[PDB]
Structures are given as C-alpha cells and as structure tokens.
Design a protein around this ligand. Structure first.
Ligand SMILES: *[C@@H]1O[C@H](CO)[C@@H](O)[C@H](O)[C@H]1NC(C)=O
Ligand SMILES: *[C@@H]1O[C@H](CO)[C@@H](O)[C@H](O)[C@H]1NC(C)=O
Ligand SMILES: *[C@@H]1O[C@H](CO)[C@@H](O)[C@H](O)[C@H]1NC(C)=O
Lengths: 368, 357, 363
C-alpha cells in the first residue's frame, strides 16, 4: 500500500456516463493519506467521448488545465460579449479560467477524445461543482433554481413560454453528452484558432508540449517538458508540463526534483516505479494505463518501462525546479562533489569511486 | 437555516459601547458554516458613533479596509515620525496597514457616522485584537502591562509620576468633544482614500446604478486583491440573475430591504433564499447565480475577495449575457426548444442589468 | 507557562549527535500553543561542530536560511553541472534552495562553529527530512532504497562492486583535506548584499540604531533579493549589561528571536478590558517569539546579543513608545493626548520629555 499510488480501478469516481462517453473524477489526494496534504487543493479529471459528440454548455467554480492525450477537439469558451474556439490536437494544452462557460466537440469520425485535466477549485478547498446551463434528462439547468416570478420578470415572458423553450418539465436530451449532425460539426468546426509554434508563449491560445525538442532524448526515450519560465499560462498556476516516452526495456535513471511535487498519470503501457524515503524506505509500485502516482519533492525515484510507455506529469510548485540524477553522465550530482568528500562519503577510494561512476556511458535514459 | 445568510439580529457581537457609540463584530464566517472555510481569514467590523466624538488612539494586529457608509469623518493615522489626516465622506474607502496607531473624529453636528471595515488579522487566522493606548475606565492602556521598574527606566521619572499622568479618566473608548480629501483623481492613490461614486457607474439605467472599483485601477485594492462595489436599486426594480466568474462576493445591506435568491447545485439544483434588511450580510460563493429583488429602495456594499481578473456574467437582458452567446446550433441542443425559439425568447428582455418587476 | 517562551532545555531535540558535532531541531511553534498558528510552516535548526570536521553530502525537502552565530565555515553547494563554495564568516547569511545538495567544513583549529537556520518545508507543513548521500554508521545512504536490479542497471556495474564502493554524519578531517577544499572559495563582501547566490553579512553594514548602550542591525526584503524571495528580515543587535531595548512594537512583522550570547529578561503584553503580561528570562540558546503589533521590551542582565527572524516583514515598522526618536505617543495630537491620558496635554508633553535617549538606554 504505497500512499503515493492510486489504482484507477478503485480511485476514480464517475460523475456522468452514458453511451456517448463518461467523465471520471479522481479522489482527494489527502483523503488518501495526510502525507499529501500539500495537494488538498488539486484534482484529476478524465474525459472520454465517442466520435462526433458535444459536451453541452456549462461552467465550474474551478480553474482547469487540460491536456489532450489523443484525438481531436474543438474547445469553445463563451464570455459575456465574446466567444473563442480553439482546435486542440494531441499534445495540445490550454487553460480554462474559472467560472468560464464552455463546451467540447469531437469532430472526428472514428477516433475517440481522451482529455485529462488538473482541476483547482476556488470556493471549497479540493471540492468543486459543475453548473450545466442546458436542461437535460440527467441534470437540471441552474435556471431552474430561480422562482417562477423571478423568471417571468427576468426574461420578460410567461412561464409556460420559458418552460416550453428553456426548461421542459421527452423533448429534452438524455444526458449532457449527446451526438451531433455532420452539418453541425461542419458548421461549428470553422473558426477555431489552432495551436502553432507561435503559441508556446501566449497567455491565451493552447500550446504544444511536443512541438519543441525534448530536454533529454536518446535511443531509449524522450523527455518533453515545459515550465513557467517559458509559458504565461504556466507561470500563473506555477506548474510545469512534461510528456515523456520510454521504450520497453529502458528506464528513467534514478533522480529527484529540487522543489517540485510531481503528479504523473500513466497514459499508455506498464511500469514499475520505486520511491525512496526516510534508515531509508522503499515505495515501489506496479502501474498500468490510467494509474496515478504522486512523487513528493526531493525524493529520488526510478521508472521502469515494462512495455512501450508514455506518461503525463504535472509539476506543482515548479518555479526554478532542478532535476538531479544519481547515475549516468550528464547532470549526475554524485559526480560533482569534491573527490576528498567522495572519499569521505561512501566506503571507497577517491579513485575507486571515480571508477564506479564513469562506467555507465549514457545519460538520463538507459537500457535494461 | 441558509448557511450563506448572516442575520444581524443574531450575528453580531458587541466589542465596546456606550452613550457615544458602539463597535460590533460579526461572528466568524466559518464558525457559521464550513462551506465558508475559504473565508476564515476575514472579519466584518461595524463602527458607529454619534456627533462630536472621538475614538481614542489605538492600534490592531490586522489590516483594515474601511468604507464610510455615511456621515463625515476625520481619520488620522499616526506614524513614528509623522502623522497625517484625511477627511472621509460617504463612499470613501481607505486601508489601514496592520499595526498603525490611529484615532477617528466625527466633526458633524447632527449626522451620525457609520463605518464598515473588512479586517484581515496577521497573527491568528480570523481572530484579531485592539490595543488601546488611552487609559480609560473601559480598558487598560497597554503601558500598564509593563513592570513598574521598567517604566521608570523607560520614561525617566519615579513611577508615581507616569502613574499620575499616563496610567491613572474617561468612561469608554468613544468620548464626546466640544486633512486631505477624496478627489476624482485620488482613485489611484497609493496612500489617500478613494471614492467609489466619484467615477461613473458601470451598469446604470432608470432602475439602478452599479459602482465598482477593481485592483486593476487602485493600488490599495490590488495589494489586498479586493474589489469594491456600491449598487443602488429602486423599489420594484430587480438585479438580473448573474454570477461572478471567480470572486467571492460579500454583500452588506446598507439601507432598505430586499429578497435574494442564491442558486447552488445539490443533478438537482437547490435554491437558497433569504430576506435581508439593514445590516444583514450574505456571502455569495464564486460561480453561483443569484438575483437581487428589492422590496424597497435598496443600497448595499460588496467586498469581492480574490477579485483579480474577475468577470461578471449575466443570464438575462441585452448586455453581458452568456446564454445569448451560445452558438446557434448548440442552443437547440441544450434547451428543449428550437434554436429559433430560444433566440426569440432571449430577445424579449430589452433591459440590461436592472429590470422592473 | 509563557506560550511564547521556548526554553532550549526542553524544546530542542537532536536529530543526531556524536563526539564530533551536534544538530538539534526545535519544536513546532504551533505544537506548543495554537496561539502561534501562522508559524506552523517554519522551524529552527541548530548546527554545532568541533574544529576541523565536515557534514557528509545531503539534502532536505526544505528551504533553509542559515545565519552563522560564531566561527568560520565553508559551505559547498553542488548542482547538476556546478559546485559552488562560499567562505562564510560570523555574521554571514545565505540561502540553501530546497533540495540542494551541500556539505559543511570547519577549517578552524581552536574555535567551534555554531550556525542557526530557519527551515521552510516544501512537502508536509512544518515537517522536513534529511537525505544523506553518504553511507554511514548513523545513516543508510538513500541510494539503498532502490532494488539491486535498478542499482545494478543504472550504475552499469555488477552489484558486489557498487556495494563495495558505495554502500557519523559529522566526521573528522585532515590538514591536507582542509587545505585542499579551502582554496578558491568566494566569501562575503560589501559587494555581496543584493545578490541571489552569495552569502551576505549583517554587520558589514551600518546599524540603524546605536548608542553607547547598544547596536541594532537589520536587513530587509527591500535590500536583499534572497530575503525578498522569502519576505523575512534579519536582525542582530547588541545590548550591554544593564542597558535595555526601549518598549516598542513591530507593525506587521512576526518576530522569532534567538539568544546568541548573554542573558536578559523579556516583557510582552497582550490584551486579556485588562492587559495580560508575558514575562521570561531568556538565556543562551533560548527562543522567544513576539507576535505582531504587541509591545515588548528587552532588559539585559549581562552583555547580550541575539538574532531575530522577521516573518511577513515586507513593509514593517518599528514603533517606540518611550524615548526621543520614533515615539508614536509623541505624534498623537496635543489637543488629544489630553483626552486619552489622565494627565493634561501639558503634563504629558513635559513627561514625554524626561527621557532623552532613543532606542537603547542605561538602567
Ligand atoms: C420582489 O420581491 C417581492 C417580495 O417577495 C415579490 O412579491 C416579487 O415577486 C419579487 N419580484 C419578482 C420579479 O418576483
Ligand atoms: C523492471 O526493472 C528493471 C529495470 O532495469 C529490469 O531489470 C526488470 O527486468 C524490469 N522488470 C521486471 C519484472 O523486473
Ligand atoms: C533590568 O530590568 C529590571 C526590571 O525588572 C530593572 O529593575 C533593572 O534596573 C534593569 N537592569 C538590570 C541590570 O537588571
């Protein structure tokens, strides 16, 4: 029972689900173990929908940072006088400000849309609600919260008229995720600004995690990363994004983060992870697709790819974070110390220790 | 028992009080309902004094954002090497940095002074204190806390001297007696008080006026990340249903009455309601739609915590309406009605913000 | 039992100790009295090592701000591509970023080394751990948390070798080693105040307050980047036996003061409307925290010197209620001093005049 390990089978809680897709909400990072108190204000959401669909209009009391793991979508954020549609592609990330009304469309014909997002509530710490404008079989419209009187006066109309149009108390859809008409997708799909290279640093439009070169990358893997330094949207939430791939058989050499708390979500493949903590303590765990493992700050950890892997990671508290490796050539901290100290540190000679470290000729990612 | 309603009648606790005035402190926001856990740090104090009086010099361990609701006043903050005075008129606001000694005078002859201030304690969350320098029959000066031996050393006189001239009198902190001002270009002053109504309202029609100042324009507010708003609503008039994007609004009923309807999710929408009167506080969480139906000429103030980059969204009316911006094809998918029906419906309320009931 | 009084006799706790040095970590401020909630995120660490020793390479999930109370030290910071060493002198302060690896050397031959540090955790509020790279009799190296498969794989070596060459915390040294590690080590200077990397010295500046009875040294988030990032003022003062720091009160800064050397009595006052008095006799290595806007006074019963960390110190203000300079009650209006004191406008002025010195006076 690794506190830092959350099994999907028993850590997710479906909010809405039907034939057109479902939305699941991870559990409270702290409810699991008080050891994760510093994350009580964060949540994990997973959205998956079937081809040619739309998530009816709604807004929530929580900022969101969504990452499109795969598929294609059209995010539309409606304001009080403006509207803005974007065409998110795989690897594309954007930030939906709190209290913003918006809807999602899956223009694709065969492919699905799997979006995973980090939610940050405004009112209740760690908790947030979804307010749907629409009047569906599965949810009332918040407009039904008001009295008939306030309604008759607000819209300037008789109730039966506003009920036979906006509410409907059979004429209303089944759930909040209904199918669309090609003519419609044909019509919604033409004005959504899409991600490009000139967006890496835009306070608005979405940016592509992979559009740039990785930071580390060899025949055994690739580590794509973005930090507040480079992105305005990421400086505000003070978080870093990094999608990293690892070829079956290779692993991410032992390393620790200086001051970032990482939340990695396995996106594809399998993996064996190891976490050391304080007499040291091991915290291994066998992760699978959709599993979430949170790695405390200043904690060495290694990732073993037991099959072609790709995982997403959120770096909470990222401003000026550094990645220290314990093995390999480049960025190895146990190889910068003064010899005499290496001599005094572990039981070995300065040369005997200068020998065991120069063996491994690769850096970052190696092959098992 | 609506958790978002703080009825004055059974919600305030008197701090000091006499013939010249009283100071009341509203109960803890979270002690009321855990839902307001995010409002634990704030306190809403209510100051009231009669003509020709003064609040003895005193300091507290909590920032203050005062807003003169009515009457005139002379606020004087005294520094360790300076001292400045200001002339507060109704509508004025200003901040009093934590640890700042100060006294208040009400120079008017027949008008009572009514001040409201949001307290932000520095030591213990949501709980602060007052430190009165004055030596009164209602409180001991903080000088009395010192050992005799130290006071003689400190001041340079045998005890009986300081004891006769400093420690001991008057009955109560508010006693009876016998200057910069807020202009139209004071609004961005980093130190002087500014005025909410000196600028144009934002939403204003024959049924009401909406005044609001944001941390964007005033250095003092940006430091607290708070937005102010004073709105007026005619009897019968109604403040169209809307919601705040990210700010948690705290509204205080100044004068008049009104019924407000907060709507929240339980999917089943649950309605929260209440009938507010003079000095009633109601806190509306972020993103929750609410309506202001005034049953008498109403005027209130509103402190919007975490107001940075906020945005106001309206459901009815012809301006700043969200429902009216949902693409044509999608309005027909969400509502049990024709995309032509909805468009027609939404276009029936010619008014904006304030409509007549 | 003064909730603000933290006696070292039963507040500190050693995380380790050996005939070569000692490291103690204070109690949780709030663990004592809830009255000190807002201090829950902080801590005080006390390091003390003999002459000619070193602290084997480690790192903690915490932001440190160490200040050297006495003696000379050599701080070596090791990053992934660099290694920086600073020649710290008494009065020198510096910041060791969260998760940074470093070791400490004491080049002195007769003196000792006493360094104090405020830890600001990053993971669990108010609680941090140490991760020592070295393998030792008092601590297992953290490279041992990994399985043998991963260690065998990473280091590209057969286990027996790694185990053979890798697997107290304050151990002795040698002249050679000392000499070696010492050469080339940038040390504090007048051109080192507003830096983000190098350590700076309090006293290498003019004290803001000083008379034949004492000196007040203070650096603020306004002058030193490293302090601005933390928003904490540092201050060291000197008060001679008999003398005493005139009653005053910080406007918004929460002060945690540690007694370096000497002895003194302290008076704090808060409301209970009656005022309550908190009094304690601070001795060497005792901690006393004075909340915001609470007036307090320090009387020295022997030549004294203490260090003070000011939390939430951005735009702080020290107000003195006694003396000639920076006297608040002296700014209040005459036509009003008369209204707030039993005395008369006249009788007060004259009295506020009796004292002639400011800040520090003779007992
Ligand atoms: C305004 O409040 C009064 C008092 O309850 C109510 O009768 C009236 O219907 C309200 N206005 C509207 C439009 O409902
Ligand atoms: C995972 O861990 C190491 C990584 O090098 C490897 O030797 C091992 O075979 C991998 N899988 C299993 C099941 O051990
Ligand atoms: C110290 O403070 C005490 C107050 O208790 C005072 O009487 C004394 O004169 C001061 N000086 C010394 C040396 O004690």
């Amino acid at each position: 029972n690794n506190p830092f390990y959350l099994r999907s089978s028993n850590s997710f809680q479906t909010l809405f689900e039907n034939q057109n897709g479902r939305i699941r909400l991870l559990q409270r990072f702290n409810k699991r173990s008080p050891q994760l108190e510093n994350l009580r204000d964060y949540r994990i959401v997973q959205f998956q929908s079937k081809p040619n669909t739309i998530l009816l209009p709604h807004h929530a009391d929580a900022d969101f940072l969504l990452f499109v793991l795969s598929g294609r979508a059209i995010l539309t954020l409606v304001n009080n006088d403006d509207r803005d549609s974007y065409n998110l592609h795989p690897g594309d990330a954007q930030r939906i400000p709190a209290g913003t009304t918006y809807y999602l469309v899956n223009p694709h014909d065969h492919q699905n849309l799997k979006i995973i997002k980090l939610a940050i509530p405004v009112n209740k710490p760690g908790r947030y609600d979804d307010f749907f404008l629409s009047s569906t079989q599965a949810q009332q419209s918040y407009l039904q919260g008001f009295s008939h009187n306030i309604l008759e006066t607000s819209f300037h109309s008789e109730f039966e008229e506003i009920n036979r149009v906006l509410l409907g108390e059979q004429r209303q859809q089944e759930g909040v995720i209904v199918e669309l008409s090609k003519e419609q997708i044909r019509q919604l799909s033409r004005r959504a600004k899409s991600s490009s290279r000139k967006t890496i640093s835009s306070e608005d439009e979405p940016f592509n995690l992979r559009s740039r070169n990785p930071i580390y990358s060899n025949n055994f893997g690739k580590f794509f990363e973005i930090t507040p330094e480079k992105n305005p949207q990421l400086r505000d939430l003070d978080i870093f994004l990094s999608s990293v791939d690892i070829n079956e058989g290779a692993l991410l050499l032992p390393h620790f983060n200086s001051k970032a708390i990482v939340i990695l979500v396995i996106n594809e493949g399998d993996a064996n992870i190891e976490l050391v903590g304080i007499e040291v303590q091991r915290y291994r765990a066998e992760l699978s697709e959709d599993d979430v493992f949170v790695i405390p700050a200043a904690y060495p950890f290694v990732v073993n790819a037991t099959s072609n892997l790709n995982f997403l990671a959120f770096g909470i508290n990222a401003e000026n974070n550094q990645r220290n490796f314990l093995a390999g050539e480049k960025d190895n901290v146990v190889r910068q110390i003064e010899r005499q100290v290496q001599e005094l540190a572990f039981p070995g000679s300065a040369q005997d220790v200068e020998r065991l470290l120069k063996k491994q000729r690769e850096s970052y990612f190696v092959d098992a």
